[PDB]
Write a protein that binds this DNA or RNA. Structure first.
Ligand SMILES: [Mg+2]
Ligand SMILES: [Mg+2]
Ligand SMILES: [Mg+2]
Ligand SMILES: [Mg+2]
Ligand SMILES: [Mg+2]
Ligand SMILES: [Mg+2]
Ligand SMILES: [Mg+2]
Lengths: 322, 321, 322, 332
DNA sequence: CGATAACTCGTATAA
DNA sequence: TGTATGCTATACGAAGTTATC
DNA sequence: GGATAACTTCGTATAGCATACATTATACGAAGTTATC
DNA sequence: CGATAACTCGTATAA
DNA sequence: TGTATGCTATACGAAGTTATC
DNA sequence: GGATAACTTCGTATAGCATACATTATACGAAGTTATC
């Protein structure tokens, strides 16, 4: 069609309207839908309802996670709607098998995993264990954790903090100003305040590294084997790295992780996030207050992030034991 | 013509719904059809004008609002899954439905909920049944101890099975809740019996000896003698477990009226409702509660504790200062 | 047209799918529109932009309130859309004129009046002054006024309260149950609980009048010259009545409604709502707690119910004088 | 008024509609027409300079144009303003609007993102809090210059009532009444909305009254009740009452600028906005003072006329009373 | 009986 | 009274006015 | 005549909000209507 | 001059 | 990462069952 | 033999609760890169 090739053409020219992470996944599900589609002798676009339904099932057979099967059907979907042609999920065949796959796989004993938690308990420990270090590497990481725990920001949002983004409350606490996050991109921003405790842990790392040199510097940066922080203002620390700072401080206190190859065996990016999220509910904070700390818009999600207490647990058990 | 194809695919993957949905899908299609041949109307495809006369009918028969909607609901799905117009996209249907809802709620119809099986009740049922011996009066006190200690649905309480059970060095059981019923389980992946409730559950495990095979289901049938008949193929039915509540409630307040009101005696939910209500009384924050049960909206939990003294209101607090 | 005679029919057919006063007012408008339409030689249906406009213009001349003209324009649009036609407020002309008529009025001086407040301080007065009487109607009127300011319910709702609707908390506080209000209609409904002191003034009138001999008995009912009750289950006390009860009680203390033809010169239906709303505001109750105490689902209405403290006022004044 | 809805360009009924919108012009705010005209004017010149057709607008061009503004360095709220007016021009004349088409829509979304990442961020008024009133008051309360007396009256009334500046330049004497307590009370007719969410009267404190009464008896504005409360004052320190001409908003914004220039000195040399008090400084200030002294968000919002928490919060966001919950936990 | 306390209708305006 | 982005103010540098130094 | 305090007007850049939609309630003086007195 | 500390990319899966 | 509404699950009188009493 | 106790299985009437839609982000092992030891 003329129109379909213009709609598509329109999109690529403004591809940056979408998240780079969206492109990465569109191209991956695309080349993966193309491969199969070829080694089966089928047309890959516009996608025929029946052929996709098949594909989805091959993905079930491959033993892939539900949510991965989704994302695939999902990117095939955007690719179309954006082209202005009806989507695969617009046919009963795709629409249903998808639910089936979501049903079958659920009972086979499959649910969604979620990051190991990094709670206050753990903060106090790691803090007191590296509180007294004098090394740049440590001084930093003990500041990256306090922020992550206190502000509940995602790791990417943190890699982005620039020094000119920090200001102070009158009483002393710090204030980071966050602009773009996973679900809000505006000029009004939002101010996430650290505490007095963490404020000092950032402060120590600020001087000990020297980044307050150019306000346009990113607050966090590399520290090479020689122990010297190498500030910058064009390249930020990869998320892969902050992810690393987690794994490490757990391969510190508890060393070597399993040979299971299972996911979330040690701390990762979301840990502090789900961590504080727990400690709050447990401390009895209101629903709205938890929503602000997290940056969530509805009970629906806050509610998700809770899997809660276990050992003796809490709630009922604490109630039964008079 | 084409619809017949949609219909076959609609079936090819019948797996896409709960066995429990199909039941009502047929149960209603059955009823709709019955009404059609008796008044002279084609039951499929449905024509608004007709559906409307049918809906206004279920009102007369006295069926409650929330039901008329399940009828209408089901009808819709039947047409949508077939390239066809639902009946609710028609101007006449949606028009009467509003008529009916306002007419019924106005005529004084009301929605009810389970009778609450609070702690006060678990304590009074623990006594007279505590020092029993009968291989049943044991299984019953253990099932109840669980229903209140986990706000697990009666259906999940069936599927539980030995393997699933394990222990915490605290000395309290901890039922692994494998095979949830939602991809993202807002309820845990591990419920944990208290201290007493554990002990009470152990008793029934030895006596019944479901223990042997781990695939066996924790609870089971118990014949007129007083002996457990373990098994790992058939689970102790939903109906069964409901009755267990029905009994205990008959054993303390006699039997039901002559009337037909529902919730005249504890049923499956009784457990949760009580649990909820009590945590409220204590001081547990709504999120903790919402989580302990496994809830996601919040109205439903407020629905339960709406009549406590704490959740009275702000004007009250203002008048009593 | 042919269809339009159907749509209009279906409509009149299940006319019970709309409120009483919706239809009441719909006709009343077509009866003003049809009028002006005859005497001016203009078709009345389908209404032509210009015509509607000339009319909306007329009403502004006849001195009507913005809010009123808006009702006329509104009813006119329901009839057209509900019958399958484009709305007259769909034409660049009707809408711009409607927007103009407001702007001009507001910019002149017009503003929207609101019920005279019946604060917590008006309760206490009306109480020690009727608290001791033994009359059959002074006992009623004081419960109503109690349930009114205490529950915030709208009079039409109050009228509908049947005895089988009341239940009790263990603390012993009546707890009325409403199911149909201006904003929502369902089987779930909400449960307004009364204070202790006020649940008492009800436990009274229930007895003294004994409307409690048949459940399906409206908690509130007429009194007669002789001071005798008069229960029912097929006749609710008139809303027009409850509006009276307020005036009366206002007379009782402030004399006679001065003659100025103006509205809100003495207590009326909403006087309890605006009242309570304002007291809570002052007292310092939160937004989500006020919203709930009045059946509102959004900050922008609670806010709409306030035109706070006069004279020495509050806030800024209190703030500067301290 | 408009650019030049063409002899052959404005084709058909876009002429009908357009005529209509102009017939009922009083339907939009004066300040709205000002922008609409200003945007067409501005789009029109880029179209001449760049050789494009100015109306109806073609997407591919509106897009090239929005990417231009971005480059000129304009802000995102400014670019949406341009797109917005252009949209009305079209919709209010019958044609299908820009950003009703894939290209404009997408570009716009892209412009927004890019800009935020370059860390562009909104500024708000510099607060005129209560400790500023006090400092500014302990200084000009000893002056007898008639100007000063006027200004101090204004600053007082401004902080005390949280009224917009345009709203103040309309308060006319006949509007000032008295309270049994001896403190003025300003009725505020000619409000801003059918439903005046802020009130129908504002009461001045006892002290802010002493401050306004001394301007009233030195200017002589009482001579004619219809007179505006505030007015000019010339080279010679002499008042000049009127009932037809109100003081401009520009001038009130000037009283704020100068009152800041007085205490803190000449203004910094960059071109940044909000480097000295402006018309919103008091509303913003008062908002913070109320928060700091424990006042319910409803009570605050009504004091200002706000109706959307999202705003009065953007003022008191960096207060300590709002540091959040995770800070309360971490802090034993 | 007729005079009265105590209570359906249309238009205007707020929720 | 609840659900849908689009109108409507202020910011401020600079140029144009008008009565007093 | 000029120079100049103190404005008013302008025009473009940006912050701050406010209403259309689609019903559903109340306000209130006037008739109309029961059972008491 | 290696050896080593400390940091792109493709698929899978959560938010 | 959020939610109106479209699927899921319990309620329960009553009929079949299958081992004990 | 005949009468339960204790259950399964039904069908319809009602409560309860959670998803499709459209992006945007994190998990993590392997491979690559650059100062420094
Ligand atoms: Mg999907
Ligand atoms: Mg302007
Ligand atoms: Mg200051
Ligand atoms: Mg000045
Ligand atoms: Mg300053
Ligand atoms: Mg000058
Ligand atoms: Mg994949």
């Amino acid at each position: 069609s003329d129109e379909v090739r213009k709609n598509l053409m329109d999109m690529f020219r403004d591809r940056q309207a979408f998240s780079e992470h969206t492109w990465k996944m569109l191209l991956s599900v695309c080349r993966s839908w193309a491969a199969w589609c070829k080694l089966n002798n089928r047309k890959w676009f516009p996608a025929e309802p029946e052929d996709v339904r098949d594909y989805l099932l091959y993905l079930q057979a491959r033993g892939l996670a539900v949510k991965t099967i989704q994302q695939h059907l999902g990117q095939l979907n955007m690719l179309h709607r954006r082209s202005g042609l009806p989507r695969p999920s617009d046919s009963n065949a795709v629409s249903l098998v998808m639910r089936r796959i979501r049903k079958e796989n659920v009972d086979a004993g499959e649910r969604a995993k979620q990051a190991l938690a990094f709670e206050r308990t753990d903060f106090d420990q790691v803090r007191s264990l590296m509180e007294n270090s004098d090394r740049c590497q440590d001084i930093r990481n003990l500041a990256f954790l306090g922020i992550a725990y206190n502000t509940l920001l995602r790791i990417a949002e943190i890699a982005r903090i620039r020094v000119k983004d920090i200001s102070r409350t009158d009483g002393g606490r710090m204030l980071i100003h966050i602009g773009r996050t996973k679900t809000l991109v505006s000029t009004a921003g939002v101010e996430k305040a650290l505490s007095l405790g963490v404020t000092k842990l950032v402060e120590r790392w600020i001087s000990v590294s020297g980044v307050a040199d150019d306000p346009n510097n990113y607050l966090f940066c590399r520290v090479r084997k020689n122990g010297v922080a190498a500030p910058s203002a064009t390249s930020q620390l990869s998320t892969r790295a902050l992810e690393g700072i987690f794994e490490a401080t757990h391969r510190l206190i508890y060393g070597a992780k399993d040979d299971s190859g299972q996911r979330y065996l040690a701390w990762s990016g979301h840990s502090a996030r789900v961590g504080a999220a727990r400690d709050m509910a447990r401390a009895g904070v209101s629903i709205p207050e938890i929503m602000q700390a997290g940056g969530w818009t509805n009970v629906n999600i806050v509610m998700n992030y809770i899997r809660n207490l276990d050992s003796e647990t809490g709630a009922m058990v604490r109630l039964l034991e008079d």
